[PDB]
């Protein structure tokens, strides 16, 4: 399968994640209707070799194709009226899966091949009073809330099926954990390998910031 890498908090909980996903998954030379690569930033409560085996997961997925070619976006592409279907388009969508509550596809944002080349900004943020997670793409229509899980999110997983860069990842904890820095580990596929441009930590030890997380082919 695709490459999955994760960092894991043990006593602290993850309370916020922003991810900036580079626009590099689509192919402007492909025929209409073809798919490209995809990349996810996923939150879970327990460790899993394949994060999507988890009984409950919340993912922020970037797909290298028009949303019309992504199954489960029907009637959920909130900017469908403004983006003509075109080769080189991309799609951004939040999805929560739960073995108890079901498969809940969030709103999807279509991205034009003619739009300025810029990273896609995903955010998932806990509202502790509301006991819900704000999710989606800030300053766009593709936004919704999800109820917090019984087991709070403690693991963030980055998955990609091909070469991809997350230009920026900001993870925030409800309490400091120095071990979070070194919890980085992958389920390797001997096909892609990771490299991180830079990792920083805030003064209070709450906010970890990764710069230029790149999955690239080994051979």
Numbering used by the authors: 23 to 241
Direct quotes from the study:
In this study, we biochemically characterized one such protein, UMAG_00027, that is highly expressed during plant infection. We show that UMAG_00027 is a secreted protein with a lectin-like fold and therefore term it Llp1 (lectin-like-protein 1). Llp1 decorated the fungal cell wall of cells grown in axenic culture or proliferating in planta, which is in agreement with its potential sugar-binding ability. CRISPR/Cas9-mediated deletion of llp1 reveals that the gene is not essential for fungal virulence.
The protein fused to a C-terminal hexa-histidine tag, was expressed in Escherichia coli SHuffle T7 cells and enriched via a two-step purification protocol combining nickel ion affinity chromatography and size exclusion chromatography (SEC). Diffraction data were collected at 2.01 Å resolution at the EMBL beamline P14 (Deutsches Elektronen-Synchrotron; DESY) under cryogenic conditions. Due to the absence of known structures suitable for molecular replacement, we employed isomorphous replacement using single-wavelength anomalous dispersion data obtained from selenomethionine incorporation. Amino acid residues 23–241 of Llp1 could be unambiguously assigned to the electron-density map and represent almost all the residues of the protein construct employed in this study (Note: N-terminal 22 residues comprising the signal peptide were not present in the Llp1 expression construct). The secondary structure elements are connected by several loops, which contain four small helices. In total, the molecule has three exposed disulfide bonds probably conserved among orthologs. Overall, this results in a compact and stable molecular fold. Taken together, our structural analysis shows that Llp1 has a high structural similarity to members of the carbohydrate-binding concanavalin A-like (ConA) lectin/glucanase family. Despite extensive efforts with microscale thermophoresis (MST), we could not detect the specific binding of Llp1 to a variety of sugars such as chitobiose, chitotetraose, N-acetylglucosamine, rhamnose, cellobiose, galactose, arabinose, mannose, maltotriose, and glucose.
